[PDB]
């Protein structure tokens, strides 16, 4: 019927003055654009078909051509920024927003999907979709007493499109648009479906990726306990965005961080800091570094939850990017912690893995480590035991590495290293 038409034939059918001929040509275009190996998006665009598709979105009496043109345009809009731009340039945004009210769920859903691709291009099209008024009819689709009565695929598409309206920076989404979306997001964050949860978490992770007032908007909605619960999920597609959101939240104020600690997040980090997925380990350690940058009572809760040995472990053996995050966690800890907290750190075995990382070809981690060593030496001086620490550092090979760094081509490196040798090894 409509499989493997030529673009020439699609054009001839869409140019006929016969709505049913147009419908069949539009379906043929949809099937072309729905094949996976290199759909001819640019050939369709060049044939001038986008404005016809867009005008078909308004044909209320031929709902199949609304559906077929919506799908065709969705797949064009899923392409490069230039292809998405051709869809927007054809007037598609207000036509899709009008389609959100279609009595045919499959057509409404297709408009949701299209708007998600357009908004997902970037900040400017995201904000243009918002200016045309997409948010109110999108949210109205979710204004039911129990989300479980909506079709699963429909709900997943709505969640994904809403997460694209929360996404991207420079600029972040408008504050009022965020406030309007957030209660529906909180509700989706409690829905039982794994993909709805994953995409809800992604949305929250976008919204918390920014200055403290943005984080506060999210935290004051009370979602942190639910984020921590999802941090413990078995599905990696959920843990990844949930951990990202928690990490973002702990880049804020110590009071925001404290919400994360009070919700029980620290009890999941034994698993996270040993997780077989390298990126989970890395982002868990990043999160820990922004918790050891906090107050001494927060550092103390890291101690009480037994996480210091887990930081020793990721410093000892992990992917290098994780090890560097662990170096940051350690210097933050040593810079902010009490003397007894730093003593405890050393008794957990931090010194040797810290020293072994002075062999690394990355001058930034070397600076971080040297700074940590100075902080620890300062605790030792406050205890009159700089010498025992000097011995400990030498007996594990650390001094060789430090003086090797005296002749390092980076400046603050050899300055800090030299300083250390003058002050502590003579």
């Amino acid at each position: 019927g409509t499989v493997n038409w030529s673009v020439e034939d699609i054009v001839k059918g869409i140019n006929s003055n016969n709505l049913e001929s147009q419908l069949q040509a539009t379906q043929a275009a949809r099937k072309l654009l729905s094949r996976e190996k290199q759909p001819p998006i640019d050939n369709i665009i060049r044939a001038g078909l986008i404005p016809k598709f867009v005008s078909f979105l308004g044909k209320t009496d031929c709902s199949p051509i609304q559906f077929e043109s919506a799908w065709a345009l969705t797949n064009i809009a899923s392409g490069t920024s230039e292809q998405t731009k051709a869809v927007v340039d054809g007037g598609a945004i207000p036509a899709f927003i009008s389609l959100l009210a279609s009595p045919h769920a499959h057509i409404s859903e297709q408009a949701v999907w299209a708007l998600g691709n357009i908004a997902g291009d970037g900040s400017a099209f995201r904000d243009l979709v918002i200016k045309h008024g997409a948010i109110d009819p999108l949210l109205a689709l979710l204004a039911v007493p129990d989300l479980s009565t909506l079709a699963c695929g429909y709900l997943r598409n709505l969640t994904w499109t809403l997460s694209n309206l929360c996404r991207n920076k420079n600029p972040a989404p408008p504050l009022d648009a965020v406030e309007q979306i957030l209660p529906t997001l909180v509700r989706l964050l409690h829905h039982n479906d794994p993909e709805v949860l994953a995409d809800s978490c992604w949305a929250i992770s976008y919204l918390t990726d920014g200055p403290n007032e943005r984080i506060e908007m999210v935290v004051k909605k009370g979602v942190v306990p639910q984020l921590v619960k999802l941090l413990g999920a078995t599905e990696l597609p959920i843990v990844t965005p949930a951990l990202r959101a928690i990490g973002n939240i702990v880049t804020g104020t110590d009071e925001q961080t404290q919400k994360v600690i009070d919700a029980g997040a620290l009890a999941v980090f034994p698993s996270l800091l040993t997780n077989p997925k390298t990126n989970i380990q890395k982002e868990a350690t990043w999160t820990m570094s922004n918790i050891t940058a906090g107050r001494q009572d927060q550092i103390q809760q890291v101690v009480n939850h037994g996480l210091v040995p887990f930081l020793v472990g990721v410093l000892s053996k992990a992917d290098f990017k994780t090890q560097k995050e662990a170096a940051w966690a350690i210097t933050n800890y040593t810079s902010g912690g009490t003397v007894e907290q730093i003593v405890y750190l050393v008794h957990c075995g931090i010194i040797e893995p810290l020293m072994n990382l002075l062999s690394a070809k990355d001058t930034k981690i070397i600076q971080v480590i040297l700074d940590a060593i100075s902080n620890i030496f300062q605790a030792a001086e406050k205890l009159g035991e700089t010498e025992k620490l000097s011995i400990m550092i030498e007996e594990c090979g650390g001094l060789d590495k430090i003086e090797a760094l005296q002749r390092h081509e980076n400046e603050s490196v050899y300055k800090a290293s030299l300083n250390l040798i003058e002050k502590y090894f003579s």
Partner: peptide, 6 residues
């Protein structure tokens, strides 16, 4: 970020 319907 973007996804086609297949």
């Amino acid at each position: 970020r973007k996804r086609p319907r297949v």
